[PDB]
Design a protein around this ligand. Structure first.
Ligand SMILES: CCCCCCCCCCCCCCCCCC(=O)OC[C@H](COP(=O)([O-])OCC(O)COP(=O)([O-])OC[C@@H](COC(=O)CCCCCCCCCCCCCCCCC)OC(=O)CCCCCCCCCCCCCCCCC)OC(=O)CCCCCCCCCCCCCCCCC
Ligand SMILES: CCCCCCCCCCCCCCCCCC(=O)OC[C@H](COP(=O)([O-])OCC(O)COP(=O)([O-])OC[C@@H](COC(=O)CCCCCCCCCCCCCCCCC)OC(=O)CCCCCCCCCCCCCCCCC)OC(=O)CCCCCCCCCCCCCCCCC
Ligand SMILES: CCCCCCCCCCCCCCCCC[C@@H](O)O[C@H](CO[C@H](O)CCCCCCCCCCCCCCC)COP(=O)(O)OCC[N+](C)(C)C
Ligand SMILES: CCCCCCCCCCCCCCCCC[C@@H](O)O[C@H](CO[C@H](O)CCCCCCCCCCCCCCC)COP(=O)(O)OCC[N+](C)(C)C
Ligand SMILES: CCCCCCCC/C=C\CCCCCCCC(=O)O[C@H](COC(=O)CCCCCCC/C=C/CCCCCCCC)COP(=O)(O)OCCN
Ligand SMILES: CCCCCCCCCCCC(=O)SCCNC(=O)CCNC(=O)[C@H](O)C(C)(C)COP(=O)(O)O
Lengths: 459, 70, 88, 107, 56, 40, 178
């Protein structure tokens, strides 16, 4: 695994020893090459895992997340090139350093054979994101947003640490392989109930769970474009990955303890999809859509059936790509209009036709149009839920209908109708933005050809 | 009838330029790949399943059929 | 479509045609600049009827606010030309 | 009230600068045309040409380490054997019962 | 020009070097996990006449 | 078009003797710039 | 559409609007032209019998019963001209309407085609640049103190002046740009 970690570390001295006007080119080229190298982790086994060493191991759940993490950095650099133009070389190098450190921590987090090492890196990712949000955000609310994004996380994560060390004091190890092979049932006890809660709540808060989702709209709205991209694409999936790893020690207590979270997610997906219908801000609408999709992923993980896990993996990958694309489109509009109010700039199809095509395809993938991987994950989760209980179909279908409604509402409001007359600074789309949009969308339509790459270890 | 009028419309130059660039680069790498793939299939062919001879242990890459996979 | 690009001459001729087919006006005294209220002695009900006839004969609707202040054939022609963007 | 209403010394908010103004064919990467052009070229070559095409072909031709055809062939020969011998295809027990020691109840 | 563009493009070589160093370190870490090489019940194999180790 | 930065009014929140002023602590005064009080 | 609205509608304007609406809806009911002409002459007669009423309270009690009767028998599916706000081709060609400022973003290779058009466009832009400076002063001096009371604009007064705020009325895209 060092053949990916070491180049990502070398990205830092290369960035800091670069010319003042070569940082973006060098960073983009070498991050793309690192993505290409990481692409060879996809050759997974039907047996246990790719156990590289005592410290790092790869799995067909970890490999798609690793590849998406490596692929996201070049897109983040391309998106950040525009709004950082008027800023000094040292500060741009610091921004690229924060992005590189975030990638390094995420890469080490997804392999992380140890649960304490996983926790340490899973919490180390917090610092670069907070600095990016509270340093290079625009509005005055960013500081407040950062505070939320901080404390919520720690409010969930501090009990987990205690639980973790407690387990190693009883089991003797926190290695995931030993934990899986030596797993034992949890008796229905108050102590075991609180151990279950301490294990679950940390990952629940970062999905986020419906009741615990307040930090996400603030953090995603006030963050710069690279921050929003990394928050929606990779950082939300840490909770799902952690739950998928940790639910192996929580059986059979998950059967009883899953009910409040299942109800919260099943009702909150409807609530947040309905919230999307009445939203005056593009970024907030995209954030609430992310909350709905992650609610579906929470349901899938809580059901803990093979089809549930496959659907959850597919949906995590598809949502990451789609939400990053949607945020990039919103930012392309914002850098022209500087308002971030959906109703202000209207009828952009007549002025930006190719960008309108990008908007249409992004809305189509968000709408879960078959045979996209978005719908593959959606349908697998829905079928698993139907087997779990036939009444889930009402909530699932209502969520599908509202999702289509708000996706097409977002498309029609911004692209169709009549152009706003007083806005005359809508310049033609740059090659950088179109390239960014294509680099988001072609991986999705190309992954629909080989779904088993993103269906997880239970395929 | 010489009543031809000017059609006010946004610039299509940049969209066409981006599409041409993307097509050129994708083809620049994909055409050699397609030609090579076809050539490999046509002349190299594919491995045929056979029983392992006694006293012979195959290499790990000899358990696969397609030459590119091998 | 295949609709001919109508000109000012056609609009003027067609407006005067509709007006001469209104029998409360004698056609020989009619002129392009003749006022409806005073030069021809028509009531405002006659004026709104004339506007309705123009609408039905040109295939589009003149809003009440614009229609209620059109008192000459020439300015009716001018309004139609401005709405339809006629060159000559 | 001789206050200036100027609360502090502040630079005026600058107006956004168009990259197309000083340079048509601007590609939206940098205000330097040479660096702009080379940034476009490297992004397009290493993103669309190298990773997107070669990586996709590499993923397409990955060897069968998941053992799909291996399992198919094993099942084929196993079904051929059991059908020939009249065995009842799949057994309901995953492990042999003779090698499991149940606890005697004596209830 | 040699000795001139090196002073301007020296940084580019670092990422590739890291990839090679990581591969070398991965192999070196592999060399410390040979306690069961050619000893698993599934792959107990008798060595070839001109073979030292089944895998490296 | 420009990133927000704290103004004078934002800075004056942190200029009091303590944070979260109360009716009792309203009459408190920040210490002198150099930690010297007039001998009176 | 073009004319600026007033603060209120006078009684005569209300009566004339009711006359037009009732005639149009009767035409919707009476499909054939001879039947429509007969009933429209009857309708005009029924308007005319109270043309000379001097009592404003009486006239206002009228037009009210009349609009109630209209709402009772108003043909819930009246005929609408296709381009009217309720027609089947109302805003059909708005997607083809492109603003004129977009031409400023054209590539020089695009402006190489149509050179005469862009030369005339440059002339128009220069005319706008000078006329605007004249227009601001003229509007400032002509507006009454305390702000405008009606959104009606004055014409040009001098020889070389242009009507104030003329650019976006003169440079409309077209009724059918494509
Ligand atoms: C249907 C068979 C097609 C066969 C031909 C091959 C086509 C290959 C396309 C590959 C993907 C396109 C890339 C996306 C970006 C578009 C690029 C662009 O800007 O165009 C510039 C170019 C130049 O136009 P321009 O004048 O310069 O630009 C003016 C404006 O842009 C205005 O431009 P516009 O108004 O013309 O709009 C652009 C166009 C293009 O933009 C798009 O919207 C394309 C993306 C739509 C998908 C949305 C996501 C949903 C998930 C679907 C996943 C399918 C992928 C399959 C694997 C693909 C491998 C990568 O959008 C549409 O026209 C709407 C089409 C809606 C289709 C919905 C139906 C989806 C399911 C269909 C069946 C799929 C499975 C079949 C299984 C059974 C049969 C085997 O225009 C085009 O070339 C059009 C693109 C082709 C149309 C795509 C419609 C169907 C293709 C589906 C994907 C491949 C199907 C594989 C099955 C083959 C058998
Ligand atoms: C008067 C006449 C006198 C003369 C008469 C005689 C001559 C004429 C008449 C007689 C001949 C009639 C026709 C005979 C047909 C066969 C003859 C022949 O030449 O066979 C050769 C040879 C013979 O076959 P074989 O060796 O016996 O069979 C072994 C198997 O095929 C081994 O399998 P494999 O693993 O090699 O298979 C690879 C597979 C797929 O290849 C891949 O997986 C490549 C993966 C690349 C993924 C990433 C692509 C790059 C990224 C794209 C991003 C876009 C943005 O290739 C295909 O998909 C072929 C598709 C064939 C479809 C046939 C119809 C299917 C219709 C089904 C639906 C029907 C209803 C609708 O077969 C081939 O050469 C296949 C060539 C496939 C080329 C794939 C190119 C992929 C390019 C990747 C990058 C693309 C970038 C975009 C630009 C690409 C360039 C445009
Ligand atoms: C502009 C108008 C159109 C012009 C173009 C017309 C031509 C259109 C044809 C292309 C689309 C039509 C669909 C037909 C597909 C043909 C190729 C397909 O069959 O091959 C696939 C093969 O492709 C791969 O399966 C999918 C590509 C993998 C995508 C990887 C992503 C690239 C990395 C980018 C970074 C990652 C970002 C996202 C993180 C998760 C599936 O083949 P498969 O039967 O299965 O086995 C391969 C061959 N074997 C048997 C030897 C093994
Ligand atoms: C706010 C946004 C979302 C945040 C996250 C919300 C999710 C947290 C929900 C917690 C999951 C369940 C907690 C406890 C489940 C135990 C089962 C219980 O509900 O059923 C009865 C439990 O009975 C009563 O509940 C006893 C406890 C009564 C006191 C609880 C307080 C009630 C409301 C508190 C909710 C506040 C939550 C937030 C706190 C800050 C059955 O009684 P009994 O079969 O005999 O005993 C079963 C347990 N044994 C077997 C281990 C002995
Ligand atoms: C987003 C903000 C959420 C904040 C945190 C939410 C998670 C809360 C989970 C509980 C926190 C601490 C739990 C302890 C960690 C696990 C350790 C463990 O399981 O050991 C138990 C110990 O169990 C406990 O001590 C639990 C005591 C909990 C005290 C703190 C209560 C916090 C609030 C309680 C109500 C809310 C609970 C769920 C809230 C969910 C989040 C909203 C049994 O060990 P022993 O006692 O040694 O062996 C038994 C024989 N003696
Ligand atoms: C088929 C659909 C339903 C139809 C039912 C509707 C029933 C409507 C019938 C009601 C009868 C009335 O007229 S309602 C009576 C309203 N009041 C008056 O008529 C008083 C003075 N009349 C005017 O001022 C007019 O404008 C006039 C002088 C005619 C022209 O004026 P000009 O000189 O400025 O054109």
């Amino acid at each position: 695994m060092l053949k990916i970690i070491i180049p990502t570390t070398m990205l830092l001295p290369m960035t800091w020893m670069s010319k003042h006007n070569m940082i973006w080119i060098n960073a983009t080229v070498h991050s793309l090459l690192i993505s290409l190298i990481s692409l060879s982790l996809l050759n997974q086994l039907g047996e246990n895992s790719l156990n590289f060493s005592l410290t790092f191991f790869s799995d067909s759940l970890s490999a798609p997340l690793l590849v998406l993490t490596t692929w996201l950095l070049p897109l983040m650099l391309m998106a950040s090139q525009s709004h950082l133009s008027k800023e000094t070389t040292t500060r741009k190098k610091l921004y690229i350093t924060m992005l590189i450190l975030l990638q390094l921590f995420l890469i080490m987090t997804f392999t992380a054979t140890e649960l304490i090492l996983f926790y340490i890196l899973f919490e180390a990712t917090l610092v670069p994101t907070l600095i990016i949000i509270t340093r290079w955000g625009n509005q005055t609310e960013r500081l407040n947003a950062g505070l939320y994004f901080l404390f919520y996380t720690l409010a969930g994560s501090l009990p987990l640490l205690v639980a973790l060390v407690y387990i190693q004091n009883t089991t003797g190890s926190l290695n995931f392989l030993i934990i899986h092979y030596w797993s034992h049932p949890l008796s229905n006890s108050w102590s075991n109930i609180f151990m279950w809660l301490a294990c679950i709540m940390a990952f629940m808060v970062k999905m986020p769970l419906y009741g615990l989702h307040l930090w996400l709209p603030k953090a995603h709205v006030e963050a710069p474009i690279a921050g929003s991209m990394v928050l929606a694409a990779v950082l939300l999936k840490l909770g799902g990955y952690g739950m998928m790893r940790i639910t192996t020690i929580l059986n059979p207590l998950t059967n009883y303890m899953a009910y409040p979270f299942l109800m919260l997610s099943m009702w909150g997906m409807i609530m947040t999809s309905s919230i999307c219908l009445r939203q005056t801000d593009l970024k907030s609408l995209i954030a609430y859509s992310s909350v709905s999709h992650m609610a579906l992923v929470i349901v899938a993980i809580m059901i803990q059936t093979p089809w549930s896990f496959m659907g959850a993996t597919a949906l995590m990958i598809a949502h990451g790509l789609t939400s990053s694309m949607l945020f990039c489109l919103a930012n392309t509009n914002y850098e022209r209009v500087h308002s971030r109010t959906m109703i202000l700039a209207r009828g952009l199809q007549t002025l930006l036709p190719l960008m309108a095509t990008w908007w249409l395809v992004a809305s189509l993938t968000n709408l879960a149009l078959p045979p996209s991987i978005n719908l593959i994950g959606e349908l697998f989760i829905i079928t698993a839920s139907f087997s779990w209980s036939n009444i889930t179909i009402i909530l699932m279908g209502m969520n599908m209908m509202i999702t289509a409604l708000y996706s097409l509402y977002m498309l029609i409001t911004t692209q169709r109708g009549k152009y706003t007359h007083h806005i005359n600074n809508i310049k033609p789309s740059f090659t950088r933005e179109n390239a960014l949009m294509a680099l988001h969308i072609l991986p999705l339509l190309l992954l629909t050809l080989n779904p088993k790459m993103i269906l997880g270890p239970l395929y | 009838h010489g009543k031809r009028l000017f059609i006010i419309k946004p610039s299509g130059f940049y969209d066409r330029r981006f599409l041409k660039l993307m097509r050129f680069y994708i083809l620049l790498t994909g055409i050699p790949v397609a030609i090579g793939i076809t050539l490999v299939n046509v002349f190299i062919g594919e491995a045929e399943l056979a029983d392992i001879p006694e006293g012979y242990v195959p290499e790990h890459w000899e358990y696969f059929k397609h030459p590119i996979s091998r | 479509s295949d609709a001919p690009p109508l000109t000012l001459e056609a609009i003027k001729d067609r407006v005067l045609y509709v007006l001469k087919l209104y029998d409360k006006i004698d056609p020989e005294k009619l002129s392009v600049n003749s006022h409806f209220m005073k030069d021809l002695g028509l009531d405002s009900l006659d004026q709104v009827e004339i506007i309705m006839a123009m609408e039905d004969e040109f295939g589009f609707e003149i809003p009440d606010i614009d229609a209620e202040k059109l008192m000459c054939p020439q300015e009716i022609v001018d309004y139609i030309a401005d709405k339809k963007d006629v060159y000559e | 009230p001789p206050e200036p209403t100027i609360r502090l010394q502040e630079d005026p908010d600058p107006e956004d600068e168009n990259l197309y103004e000083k340079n048509p064919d601007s590609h939206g990467y940098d205000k330097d045309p040479i660096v702009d052009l080379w940034n476009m070229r490297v992004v397009f070559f290493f993103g669309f040409s190298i990773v997107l095409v070669l990586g996709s072909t590499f993923v397409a031709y990955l060897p069968d380490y998941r053992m799909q055809e291996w399992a198919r062939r094993e099942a084929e020969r196993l079904v051929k054997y059991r059908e020939a011998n009249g065995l009842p295809l799949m057994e309901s027990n995953c492990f042999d019962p003779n090698k499991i020691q149940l606890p005697e109840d004596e209830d | 020009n040699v000795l001139q563009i090196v002073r301007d493009h020296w940084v580019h070589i670092l990422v590739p070097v890291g990839f090679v160093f990581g591969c070398y370190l991965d192999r070196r870490s592999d060399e410390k996990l040979t306690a069961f090489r050619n000893k698993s019940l599934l792959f107990k194999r008798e060595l070839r006449p001109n073979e030292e180790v089944t895998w490296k | 078009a420009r990133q927000w930065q704290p103004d004078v009014e934002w800075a004056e929140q942190f200029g009091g003797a303590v944070m979260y002023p109360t009716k009792e602590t309203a009459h408190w005064k920040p210490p002198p710039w150099n930690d010297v009080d007039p001998p009176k | 559409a073009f004319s600026a609205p007033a603060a209120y509608l006078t009684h005569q304007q209300k009566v004339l609007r009711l006359y037009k609406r009732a005639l149009r809806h009767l035409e919707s009911w009476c499909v054939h032209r001879d039947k429509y002409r007969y009933f429209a002459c009857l309708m005009r007669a029924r308007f005319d019998e109270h043309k000379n009423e001097k009592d404003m309270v009486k006239a206002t009690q009228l037009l009210r019963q009349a609009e109630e009767e209209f709402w009772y028998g108003q043909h819930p599916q009246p005929y609408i001209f296709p381009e009217s706000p309720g027609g089947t081709s109302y805003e059909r060609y708005e997607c083809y309407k492109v603003p004129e400022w977009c031409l400023d973003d054209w590539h020089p290779s695009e402006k190489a085609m149509y050179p005469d058009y862009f030369a005339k466009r440059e002339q128009w832009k220069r005319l706008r640049r000078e006329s605007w400076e004249r227009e601001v002063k003229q509007l400032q001096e002509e507006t009454p103190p305390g702000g405008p009371r009606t959104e009606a604009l004055p014409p040009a007064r001098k020889e070389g002046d242009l009507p104030p705020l003329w650019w976006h009325i003169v440079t409309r895209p077209r009724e059918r740009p494509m």
